[PDB]
Amino acid sequence: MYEPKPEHRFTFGLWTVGNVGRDPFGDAVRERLDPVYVGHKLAELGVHGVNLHDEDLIPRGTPPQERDQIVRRFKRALDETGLKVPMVTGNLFSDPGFKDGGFTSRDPWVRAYAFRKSLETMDLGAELGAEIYVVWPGREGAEVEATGKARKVWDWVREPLNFMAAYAEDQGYGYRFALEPKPNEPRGDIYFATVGSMLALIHTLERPERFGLNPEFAHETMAGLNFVHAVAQALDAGKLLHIDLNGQRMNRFDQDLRFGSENLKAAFLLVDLLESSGYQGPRHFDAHALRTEDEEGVWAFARGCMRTYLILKERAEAFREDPEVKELLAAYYQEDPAALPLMDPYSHEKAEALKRAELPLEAKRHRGYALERLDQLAVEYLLGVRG
Amino acid sequence: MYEPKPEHRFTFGLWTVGNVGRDPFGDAVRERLDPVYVGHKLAELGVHGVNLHDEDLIPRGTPPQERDQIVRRFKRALDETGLKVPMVTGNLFSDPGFKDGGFTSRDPWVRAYAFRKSLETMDLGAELGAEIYVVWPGREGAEVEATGKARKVWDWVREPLNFMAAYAEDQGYGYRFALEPKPNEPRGDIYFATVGSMLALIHTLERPERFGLNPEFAHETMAGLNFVHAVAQALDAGKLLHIDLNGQRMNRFDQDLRFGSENLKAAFLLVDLLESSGYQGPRHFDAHALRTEDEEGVWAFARGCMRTYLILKERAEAFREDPEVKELLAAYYQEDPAALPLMDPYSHEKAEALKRAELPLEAKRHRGYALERLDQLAVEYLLGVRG
Amino acid sequence: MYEPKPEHRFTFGLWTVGNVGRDPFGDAVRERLDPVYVGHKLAELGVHGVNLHDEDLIPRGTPPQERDQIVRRFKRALDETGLKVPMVTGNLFSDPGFKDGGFTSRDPWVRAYAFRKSLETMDLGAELGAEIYVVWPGREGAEVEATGKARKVWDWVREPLNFMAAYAEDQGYGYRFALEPKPNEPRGDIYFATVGSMLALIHTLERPERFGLNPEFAHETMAGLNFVHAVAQALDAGKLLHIDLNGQRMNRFDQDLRFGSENLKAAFLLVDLLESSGYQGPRHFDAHALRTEDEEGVWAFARGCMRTYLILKERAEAFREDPEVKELLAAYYQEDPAALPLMDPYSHEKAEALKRAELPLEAKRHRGYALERLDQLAVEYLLGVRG
Amino acid sequence: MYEPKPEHRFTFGLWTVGNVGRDPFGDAVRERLDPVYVGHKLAELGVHGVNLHDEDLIPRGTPPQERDQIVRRFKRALDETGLKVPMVTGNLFSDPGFKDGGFTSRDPWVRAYAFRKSLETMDLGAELGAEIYVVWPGREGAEVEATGKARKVWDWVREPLNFMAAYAEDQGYGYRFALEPKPNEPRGDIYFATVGSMLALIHTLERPERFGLNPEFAHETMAGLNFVHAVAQALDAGKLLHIDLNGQRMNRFDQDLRFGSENLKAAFLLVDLLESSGYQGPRHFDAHALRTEDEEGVWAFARGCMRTYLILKERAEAFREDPEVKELLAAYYQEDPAALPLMDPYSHEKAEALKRAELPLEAKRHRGYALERLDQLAVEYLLGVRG
């Protein structure tokens, strides 16, 4: 009764369910899955679509003849299944060429390489129907500041982002560009570390209207930052073009846990934010199954992401309809209209009225906002003691 | 031989050296210092100026008659000493009225109060020669998301910031407005949490040219974020209008340690960034002495902030002149001009040239960037083994 | 239907519900509550008992005559209500005397003061029926390591802990001593930072059998550490003498949120651990209401702590009875008895059997442990979709 | 003039300098180095010794015939060079068999495997002259608590640790066993997370005198904990048998930076602690070169670890000899002998004397400890402005 439908727009990257379970201290625990195989499986599960990096589909150093049989056979599978490919993104982190940056490498040959790799992935994307192009700057950071490179990297990424947007409009591609921040890892620090950082950068590009955000839950949470506040800002800027959903314990390596598995309350209020905002983009699960899992466990991971989202959606809906909740929100959003005309846009006499206004300070000093009761109500709904 | 001069622009808030050493688990360990007293002391130490909140100088509920003797006697002291007051800022965190927000309180009477409090501090500032107005949104955050207030707060702060800038230009004040982010505390999370967050907001105000950043070292570092990356972005945006300098161990309460006392290498490369950028605003030490200190220890704290800054400045200068360092930076900023014309602004034939270009990938795969040697050189300079 | 009974052993420190809502950047938002008043209220709510610091009941500098009317009138209230006082603890953090340590102050006069203050609180405790004495070393840490004091503090706290235990057995008090770790705050770092740290120290005292742990949820979580693992170790050592319950977001100031309000899943498995272990000590809520609250909100905070605990207890019970859950735990705790006799205590021929044993490695390599399904089941129970 | 000598006891694991620079988002950037090659290089650099995992020398699935040519040719190299092998340790993290634990796997076949793998590495160690056996429990943690395994893991590790110690004494090996805590990674949380955790466990083993600690700087720092406090406790317990030295920025993935490269002040006071304590075990650098490095950069990494250690050693020596420093430490370690006889071991009349003693409280309230001056002195020495 919490079954995924295409209107839900649940997507999985090829690399999410396809993760072989290697980590920095361990071998692969799983077999590599064929891309055609995972298209059929995700279709069975009720997924709207599948995302990919260029290297997810066509591994580095594949002759163009073989490159084309691969893409041919993948498109047939998408045709057979009705799966979309909403989002693509160039792998700019794996090649050793990128060891000190893709776009922010000091070597212009390497920045060129990063470039061309991006253009070619844009071309593959269009060949597959992709509408969103994601830029994750995973290799764009430093551990050695003595270089002074932090002064230079802003221009360097403006340049290809601008070049990428111009190439797209030249080719008649319809890409919106979605920028994905991460505070660290694989670099000691990544330059474009926050949602706000990527939001500010956008306003300096040449075609800003083409550019938005792909915030990821684990990325912000890695640094102990509030993901719900960050996504609200992106929404208020009109720049939420894509969202990456998963779970994470604060202040350590990127876990990419199943969605909702660790921070139920944050996931709750996030699903609430997205749904009630009328966000219409993909809900991507950028997560992998635990390393303790076999292939069966991978598909239980996939099913569990989508099911947990649907449970919280229904639950946040019922929470907002509760009479006591409505009564509580009404009382604290209470606005005295005598207060309101001291407010809003500037006028000389509004300032003078304000400075002479007799404010009800002791009344506002004593005021309780009843957020403890409101917060207990939400926890009891989350617990299903009220739902 | 590391003695502060006015061209150094070292400032101290009244509340920094004036901190009585109360904390959430302890009483005050020190006496409250008279403002006139601390102006004479900071003048002796070689400080360019002193900052203040309204309530630092005029405690809440002081009759205007007494308000004026206070301001009179303070101005005389500034006259006697030649100290400036570069920066003022309205205390929007102490009054219980602000328990659930200043500008982001849900009660319009409280948002009005926050407002008027700001206008009045702008007026005091002008009466004292202040040029920078700082906004620290310490009470603007949440611990209960069930309210949905995160959707609303962006317009609510746009409104007063816009109103504040309009009032200023109406009165012929010359204020630049400096916005100070902090990731949490006193709130579980503060909405405007990062440098990037405040940078993005600025681009949505009505008079953006009047608005910049006051990043604080301890604020970014509290969340394990790289302060040097954050300040570089503000500099590249042209929005570094003020900077708050101190020290901090990551991921806990705000310590406000003496500058350079904990993260020497970060302070080093920060002083390097500021100086070599030609930043010309105040160097504010928003820090207090350790709670183990008496008044003597306070002035040793004050002397130590400035002296540590001057030592690193000289050191970063010598580091940059080292022949081996110059040789190392030259080799890795190495640019092949054949790589460069594949670069920079878009053209149809530049894209085609790029996609047909034969890139030297194996050569760039094997390439070491010698950052271990560069990083060891900087540590040895820091240690004075080379300086 | 989740109503607190005395067999639940829910206790509140006087300082929890009595918190006036002052913080490092704000005034008090509430009135100070009379101790007799809060005894009657907690009795109404269904609390087993109330804890106190010496200075919670008798403020510093109260003449012994007045000290005795206070204690007289408090005992009457306890008699009237049937409330217990399970736990007392000397305030060794507030007095400015303790600015650089209580037990770990370098000044022997201050260590003597800390001492005597502890003995006198032991005496008050006995006069009130207290059975557990808690030591929170909040002032025992450093921000300046140049002193070398880290080498000395271990002997210094051995000395008074040993002296305190000897005084108690001399006076015929029945105290068990419960040691409370915290990683930092109010000190930059506190020496006894972890559960493991306090566990190790105990084994060096003279009467170790008298000494155990008071782990606090917020303390361990402040440092991003797993509280459930920490409490399991204390339980396995037989040293869980008391537990302090609340909520906390990782890596910042101590929030002391209402229990279960932030980390539902951790609170779930914690209540499960405690209950199924047969822990019989007090469940203390060391937490305060949000600073946005009036007195009504305080009692909603108190009611919510206990109600949330009871909901989870019932829920963990139901989770453990689920057939699928039982089937899942059975399959993975699966033990082949041929594996087992290679196990357990050493013998020369067991070692030789092991080294010659032909192990089923490929079978164990391919093995999935189905923890994704188990974890999704627990989340669905938590959400009440299954409960 | 900071050249490594064997009395310095600098060791490198084969896996440190041998790290191929693969990470969770990137390919290997370097060639695999031959073990005989790295023995000759480390000998050139001035290293006392080289450590190894079983799989560093003999990769999984090497026939015993080939196993023996390998060990033969390695021993010759050690003979030629005079390098020691102070420490060995079984790789219990890489094999997929260990996906849900080595010693704490729920499958008794896997616990047997972990066991036998340990015994066999103990045998190789003895064949090579090893004196210290290290246990890093990297795979001993959980991300799914629903299993209840946290209750069981303490006995499970007691069992093999006890079995390992008995096997060693049976074989007449001279191993001391060194236990290495880590708070997380590769597991979401690792059970034995802290120095205190491992210290407490030791006291429950059968031959505790054989067991101590191998604390690693990055491990404690990953969780924002103070490594200097943790190492002081191990020293005070007499359990520092080995130490792993490197650098780390708090609250993220394990970086394993070059020693001293990031936290100069912490490294300073650590080298001070070790040296002035008369610690005589190995100084292991468990660190790798940055991923931006070629093989030249690796040896610059290796050289820089040792040189940075020697610079700080000399510096901490000079700091302690400074007259002003000695005068400062003397004044604050000041002990009034009238305070001291209230102190130390219990007596009925000492308690009575204490409770009647008239303490000099106002004098101690006003007391400043001059730690701001002391801390500024140590920073100025660190900076070489005083050295």
XYZ file of C-alpha atoms in Angstrom, chain C residues 131-383:
253
model
C 21.653 6.119 47.275
C 23.674 7.270 44.256
C 26.374 9.937 44.263
C 27.323 11.343 40.869
C 30.585 12.956 39.909
C 30.537 15.169 36.830
C 34.037 16.526 36.145
C 32.864 19.512 34.113
C 35.689 21.810 35.154
C 38.357 19.096 34.852
C 40.021 19.794 31.535
C 42.344 22.175 29.730
C 42.750 24.605 26.875
C 46.426 25.185 27.636
C 48.547 22.036 27.416
C 51.824 23.930 28.004
C 51.335 23.374 31.747
C 51.894 19.646 31.481
C 49.002 19.141 33.890
C 47.697 16.205 31.839
C 50.396 14.082 33.468
C 49.164 14.858 36.984
C 45.371 14.817 36.936
C 44.965 11.027 37.161
C 46.536 10.811 40.621
C 44.719 13.924 41.741
C 41.247 12.445 41.098
C 42.181 8.958 42.368
C 42.984 10.686 45.632
C 39.578 12.328 46.343
C 37.544 9.560 44.800
C 39.384 7.143 47.148
C 38.990 9.608 50.004
C 35.271 10.037 49.239
C 34.640 6.261 49.201
C 36.500 5.855 52.519
C 34.594 8.675 54.174
C 31.321 7.089 53.036
C 32.114 3.652 54.424
C 33.392 5.309 57.606
C 30.075 7.145 58.051
C 28.067 4.092 57.113
C 26.570 5.759 54.032
C 25.410 3.338 51.357
C 26.492 5.368 48.321
C 27.400 3.838 45.042
C 29.520 6.326 43.140
C 28.567 7.098 39.558
C 31.069 8.777 37.256
C 29.823 10.979 34.399
C 32.096 11.571 31.370
C 31.755 14.488 28.920
C 34.103 15.178 25.967
C 34.134 18.993 26.314
C 32.266 22.070 27.592
C 32.613 24.065 29.705
C 36.287 23.213 29.007
C 37.829 23.118 25.553
C 38.469 19.452 26.334
C 37.567 17.513 29.488
C 40.114 14.852 30.587
C 37.547 12.167 31.402
C 35.937 12.445 27.989
C 34.444 9.016 27.256
C 32.651 6.089 28.865
C 35.780 4.006 28.288
C 37.930 6.607 30.001
C 35.890 6.464 33.194
C 35.682 2.659 33.035
C 39.467 2.397 32.896
C 39.984 4.817 35.805
C 37.651 2.803 38.059
C 39.976 -0.174 37.876
C 42.680 1.895 39.548
C 40.680 3.071 42.550
C 40.976 1.380 45.934
C 37.346 0.264 46.301
C 36.351 -0.281 42.631
C 33.248 -2.224 43.567
C 31.738 1.030 44.873
C 32.221 2.833 41.565
C 30.305 2.814 38.288
C 29.112 4.932 35.374
C 26.519 7.617 34.695
C 26.673 7.912 30.891
C 24.675 10.790 29.356
C 23.203 10.541 25.848
C 24.069 14.136 24.884
C 27.680 13.855 26.118
C 28.700 10.955 23.913
C 26.633 12.292 20.985
C 28.346 15.726 21.190
C 31.442 13.958 19.847
C 29.637 11.889 17.221
C 30.147 8.708 19.262
C 27.631 5.845 19.460
C 25.885 5.960 22.810
C 24.385 2.483 22.391
C 27.850 0.889 22.042
C 29.089 2.849 25.081
C 26.188 1.770 27.301
C 26.591 -1.856 26.173
C 30.202 -1.808 27.384
C 29.217 -0.355 30.743
C 26.469 -2.991 31.060
C 28.894 -5.780 30.154
C 31.241 -4.493 32.857
C 28.388 -4.395 35.327
C 28.958 -0.703 35.861
C 25.731 1.028 34.750
C 24.652 2.570 38.020
C 22.658 5.448 36.602
C 21.755 6.872 33.204
C 21.101 10.421 31.991
C 18.611 10.594 29.159
C 18.057 13.394 26.633
C 18.616 14.319 22.974
C 21.343 16.094 21.006
C 22.454 16.941 17.469
C 26.062 15.848 16.945
C 29.135 18.127 17.081
C 28.073 21.301 18.849
C 27.170 22.768 22.232
C 25.257 20.651 24.737
C 21.590 21.094 23.799
C 19.920 18.844 26.393
C 16.824 18.365 24.196
C 13.712 16.417 25.264
C 14.319 12.651 25.134
C 13.690 10.997 21.775
C 12.941 14.328 20.051
C 15.847 14.244 17.602
C 17.316 10.741 17.264
C 14.299 8.400 17.370
C 16.159 5.345 16.136
C 19.012 5.685 18.663
C 16.529 6.306 21.483
C 14.639 3.216 20.302
C 17.547 0.805 20.468
C 18.709 2.422 23.736
C 15.391 1.836 25.499
C 15.553 -1.674 24.033
C 19.055 -2.213 25.464
C 18.133 -0.930 28.913
C 14.874 -2.810 29.254
C 16.024 -6.152 27.917
C 19.175 -5.997 30.076
C 17.177 -5.785 33.261
C 18.699 -2.455 34.251
C 16.987 -1.398 37.481
C 18.453 2.008 38.243
C 16.838 5.449 37.717
C 15.920 6.789 34.291
C 16.981 10.405 34.744
C 16.006 13.062 32.212
C 18.917 15.508 32.274
C 17.288 17.902 29.848
C 15.592 21.270 29.824
C 12.665 22.771 27.921
C 13.456 24.871 24.825
C 14.224 28.549 25.507
C 11.070 29.431 23.523
C 8.903 28.010 26.325
C 6.953 29.380 29.264
C 6.160 27.338 32.377
C 3.361 25.458 30.642
C 5.880 24.392 28.028
C 8.200 23.142 30.785
C 5.620 20.647 32.040
C 4.845 19.587 28.472
C 8.578 18.951 28.152
C 8.530 16.838 31.343
C 5.431 14.885 30.259
C 6.940 14.329 26.816
C 10.198 12.788 28.066
C 8.377 10.064 29.981
C 5.666 9.460 27.385
C 8.238 9.089 24.586
C 10.179 6.550 26.665
C 7.032 4.452 27.302
C 6.028 4.484 23.616
C 9.441 3.190 22.524
C 9.502 0.539 25.256
C 6.205 -0.904 24.041
C 7.391 -0.586 20.463
C 10.739 -2.379 20.971
C 8.792 -5.137 22.739
C 6.545 -5.618 19.734
C 9.450 -5.472 17.286
C 11.203 -8.356 19.080
C 8.077 -10.554 18.871
C 7.670 -10.242 15.117
C 7.974 -13.662 13.379
C 9.967 -12.358 10.440
C 12.354 -10.540 12.764
C 12.843 -13.717 14.807
C 13.441 -15.694 11.639
C 15.997 -13.138 10.477
C 17.961 -13.064 13.775
C 17.939 -16.862 13.882
C 19.508 -17.215 10.434
C 22.357 -14.857 11.075
C 23.193 -15.961 14.591
C 23.320 -19.427 12.946
C 26.210 -21.441 14.479
C 27.756 -24.546 12.930
C 28.946 -26.693 15.886
C 31.891 -27.897 13.802
C 33.079 -24.279 13.815
C 32.536 -23.928 17.549
C 35.066 -26.546 18.783
C 37.782 -24.619 17.036
C 36.617 -21.868 19.378
C 36.693 -20.911 23.033
C 39.492 -21.611 25.513
C 43.044 -22.364 24.384
C 44.514 -25.818 23.994
C 47.617 -26.895 22.075
C 45.577 -29.305 19.947
C 42.779 -26.769 19.367
C 45.402 -24.502 17.822
C 46.674 -27.374 15.690
C 43.162 -28.388 14.654
C 42.418 -24.776 13.689
C 45.568 -24.407 11.588
C 44.793 -27.626 9.722
C 41.045 -26.969 9.464
C 39.602 -26.639 5.959
C 37.487 -23.499 6.172
C 34.429 -22.807 3.936
C 35.710 -19.428 2.735
C 34.030 -18.931 -0.612
C 30.688 -19.742 1.001
C 31.305 -17.073 3.648
C 32.568 -14.635 1.019
C 29.282 -14.787 -0.904
C 27.204 -14.626 2.287
C 24.704 -11.806 2.686
C 23.503 -11.051 6.197
C 20.159 -9.494 5.255
C 20.649 -6.456 7.496
C 19.026 -4.123 4.963
C 15.753 -6.034 5.359
C 16.151 -6.195 9.116
C 16.916 -2.465 9.269
C 13.889 -1.618 7.069
C 11.689 -3.774 9.364
C 12.830 -1.823 12.413
C 12.197 1.510 10.694
C 8.685 0.388 9.705
C 8.009 -0.640 13.317
C 9.370 2.701 14.546
C 7.005 4.404 12.098
